[PDB]
Design an enzyme around this catalytic site. Sequence first.
Site, PDB file in Angstrom:
ATOM      1  N   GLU A  95     -24.740 -52.062  30.375  1.00 23.67           N
ATOM      2  CA  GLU A  95     -24.431 -50.893  31.156  1.00 23.67           C
ATOM      3  C   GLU A  95     -25.674 -50.544  32.008  1.00 23.67           C
ATOM      4  O   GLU A  95     -26.807 -50.701  31.561  1.00 23.67           O
ATOM      5  CB  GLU A  95     -24.126 -49.747  30.159  1.00 23.67           C
ATOM      6  N   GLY A  99     -39.434 -56.049  31.546  1.00 28.12           N
ATOM      7  CA  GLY A  99     -39.464 -55.702  30.133  1.00 28.12           C
ATOM      8  C   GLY A  99     -40.191 -56.643  29.196  1.00 28.12           C
ATOM      9  O   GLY A  99     -40.751 -57.665  29.604  1.00 28.12           O
ATOM     10  N   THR A 100     -40.191 -56.258  27.913  1.00 25.42           N
ATOM     11  CA  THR A 100     -40.847 -57.000  26.837  1.00 25.42           C
ATOM     12  C   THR A 100     -40.132 -58.339  26.546  1.00 25.42           C
ATOM     13  O   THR A 100     -40.813 -59.340  26.338  1.00 25.42           O
ATOM     14  CB  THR A 100     -40.969 -56.126  25.562  1.00 25.42           C
ATOM     15  N   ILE A 136     -35.113 -53.978  38.279  1.00 25.94           N
ATOM     16  CA  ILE A 136     -35.255 -52.624  37.721  1.00 25.94           C
ATOM     17  C   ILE A 136     -36.199 -52.558  36.497  1.00 25.94           C
ATOM     18  O   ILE A 136     -36.393 -51.465  35.947  1.00 25.94           O
ATOM     19  CB  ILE A 136     -33.894 -51.972  37.399  1.00 25.94           C
ATOM     20  N   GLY A 137     -36.830 -53.672  36.138  1.00 30.44           N
ATOM     21  CA  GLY A 137     -37.756 -53.673  35.016  1.00 30.44           C
ATOM     22  C   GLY A 137     -38.271 -55.044  34.645  1.00 30.44           C
ATOM     23  O   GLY A 137     -37.515 -56.013  34.676  1.00 30.44           O
ATOM     24  N   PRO A 190     -40.821 -44.409  26.670  1.00 33.63           N
ATOM     25  CA  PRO A 190     -40.039 -43.793  27.749  1.00 33.63           C
ATOM     26  C   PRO A 190     -39.358 -44.792  28.716  1.00 33.63           C
ATOM     27  O   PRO A 190     -38.263 -44.507  29.200  1.00 33.63           O
ATOM     28  CB  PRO A 190     -41.087 -42.943  28.469  1.00 33.63           C
ATOM     29  N   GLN A 191     -39.949 -45.989  28.920  1.00 34.25           N
ATOM     30  CA  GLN A 191     -39.394 -47.031  29.785  1.00 34.25           C
ATOM     31  C   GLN A 191     -38.063 -47.591  29.207  1.00 34.25           C
ATOM     32  O   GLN A 191     -37.284 -48.203  29.941  1.00 34.25           O
ATOM     33  CB  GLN A 191     -40.438 -48.150  29.988  1.00 34.25           C
ATOM     34  N   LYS A 230     -30.136 -58.788  32.153  1.00 33.26           N
ATOM     35  CA  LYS A 230     -31.427 -59.135  31.581  1.00 33.26           C
ATOM     36  C   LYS A 230     -31.457 -60.616  31.305  1.00 33.26           C
ATOM     37  O   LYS A 230     -30.642 -61.097  30.534  1.00 33.26           O
ATOM     38  CB  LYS A 230     -31.666 -58.332  30.292  1.00 33.26           C
ATOM     39  N   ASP A 256     -39.565 -50.639  19.210  1.00 33.44           N
ATOM     40  CA  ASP A 256     -40.409 -50.494  20.389  1.00 33.44           C
ATOM     41  C   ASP A 256     -39.936 -49.363  21.300  1.00 33.44           C
ATOM     42  O   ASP A 256     -39.833 -49.547  22.518  1.00 33.44           O
ATOM     43  CB  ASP A 256     -40.473 -51.809  21.155  1.00 33.44           C
TER      44      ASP A 256
HETATM   45  C1  LIG Z   1     -36.506 -48.758  39.187  1.00 39.88           C
HETATM   46  C2  LIG Z   1     -37.676 -48.197  38.418  1.00 39.88           C
HETATM   47  O1  LIG Z   1     -38.769 -48.760  38.354  1.00 39.88           O
HETATM   48  N1  LIG Z   1     -37.523 -46.935  37.735  1.00 39.88           N
HETATM   49  S1  LIG Z   1     -36.136 -46.003  37.665  1.00 39.88           S
HETATM   50  O2  LIG Z   1     -35.553 -45.782  38.955  1.00 39.88           O
HETATM   51  O3  LIG Z   1     -36.358 -44.863  36.837  1.00 39.88           O
HETATM   52  C3  LIG Z   1     -35.092 -46.976  36.793  1.00 39.88           C
HETATM   53  C4  LIG Z   1     -33.764 -47.195  37.252  1.00 39.88           C
HETATM   54  C5  LIG Z   1     -32.862 -47.901  36.466  1.00 39.88           C
HETATM   55  C6  LIG Z   1     -33.257 -48.431  35.230  1.00 39.88           C
HETATM   56  N2  LIG Z   1     -32.344 -49.107  34.396  1.00 39.88           N
HETATM   57  C7  LIG Z   1     -32.652 -49.837  33.280  1.00 39.88           C
HETATM   58  C8  LIG Z   1     -31.741 -50.395  32.508  1.00 39.88           C
HETATM   59  C9  LIG Z   1     -30.296 -50.217  32.642  1.00 39.88           C
HETATM   60  O4  LIG Z   1     -29.763 -49.590  33.553  1.00 39.88           O
HETATM   61  N3  LIG Z   1     -29.685 -50.870  31.595  1.00 39.88           N
HETATM   62  C10 LIG Z   1     -30.659 -51.500  30.790  1.00 39.88           C
HETATM   63  C11 LIG Z   1     -30.441 -52.215  29.646  1.00 39.88           C
HETATM   64  C12 LIG Z   1     -31.548 -52.801  28.991  1.00 39.88           C
HETATM   65  C13 LIG Z   1     -32.788 -52.572  29.528  1.00 39.88           C
HETATM   66  N4  LIG Z   1     -33.975 -53.081  28.952  1.00 39.88           N
HETATM   67  C14 LIG Z   1     -34.988 -52.647  29.628  1.00 39.88           C
HETATM   68  S2  LIG Z   1     -34.701 -51.622  31.021  1.00 39.88           S
HETATM   69  C15 LIG Z   1     -33.018 -51.781  30.674  1.00 39.88           C
HETATM   70  C16 LIG Z   1     -31.949 -51.235  31.338  1.00 39.88           C
HETATM   71  C17 LIG Z   1     -34.577 -48.196  34.766  1.00 39.88           C
HETATM   72  C18 LIG Z   1     -35.461 -47.499  35.566  1.00 39.88           C
END
Ligand SMILES: CC(=O)NS(=O)(=O)c1ccc(N/C=C2\C(=O)Nc3ccc4ncsc4c32)cc1
Length: 275
Positions: free
Chosen positions: A72, A13-14, A10-11, A121-122, A33, A118
């Site tokens: 979460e 990240g940095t 799902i990411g 929007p991500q 993570k 940091d």
């Molecule tokens: C999947 C995609 O590329 N975009 S999305 O569908 O918009 C999407 C879907 C789900 C998510 N969740 C991201 C996170 C989450 O749930 N807890 C954390 C905790 C820390 C953290 N540090 C970087 S991220 C993240 C997430 C993001 C985008």
Amino acid sequence: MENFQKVEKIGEGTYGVVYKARNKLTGEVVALKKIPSTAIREISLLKELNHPNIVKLLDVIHTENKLYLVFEFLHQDLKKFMDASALTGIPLPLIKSYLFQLLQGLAFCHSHRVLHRDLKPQNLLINTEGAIKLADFGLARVVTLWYRAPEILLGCKYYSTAVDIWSLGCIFAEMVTRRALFPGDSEIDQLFRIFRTLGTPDEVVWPGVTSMPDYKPSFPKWARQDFSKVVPPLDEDGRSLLSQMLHYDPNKRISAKAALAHPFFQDVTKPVPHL
Ligand SMILES: CC(=O)NS(=O)(=O)c1ccc(N/C=C2\C(=O)Nc3ccc4ncsc4c32)cc1
């Protein structure tokens, strides 16, 4: 880690890659993570930094020299929601609700002397109930420069909570206009985009600016633009608030707690987004 089953990435990240995962000993869906004694202790302080607008750090697992953070899970980030809402625009009441909630989250972190450093929007996560939450709060203690405060770009090593207010002002402008405010692709492009909009800073508007490490007297001198040109059709309350969030001098920049009292939020509500 034998207790978790990876579902999907799902990411990237940095600080590391984030996966959607299932906890086999509770049935819980989480964000996993995968990331020194100083780091274990700082990250353990973040387990107590709990607030409704901060993504919950559920557990910290240190095994085989690898560090996993269990968070979460939320189903969407603000980057995706802004992209999905680009043809129509995020309705102003929802922009206002999200900004208000993010300021509550920052006011809480900042009251505990924790900076995000940091915001982008991500790392702003949303749910179906109308909540928005900050992710990666505290971990800082191509990477996007778009939301970087000018004092960071000018080489301040001991920057303040004001850096998060700057980033959030950039994000507010982007929700309103449906375009990034300062999409720099290098540190100097980032700084010069800021200067072309807000004017090249000088000792009048930012005392001490000319003695900062990366300040150059040879910077071009651009005149400032009116916010009425920068974020139409934002109303006067919103433009006033944004201008205070984007003051050059971090000392003049509005605090999260003072921003919450701004008249822009007099009619704030909590709408439910279309996800
Ligand atoms: C999947 C995609 O590329 N975009 S999305 O569908 O918009 C999407 C879907 C789900 C998510 N969740 C991201 C996170 C989450 O749930 N807890 C954390 C905790 C820390 C953290 N540090 C970087 S991220 C993240 C997430 C993001 C985008």
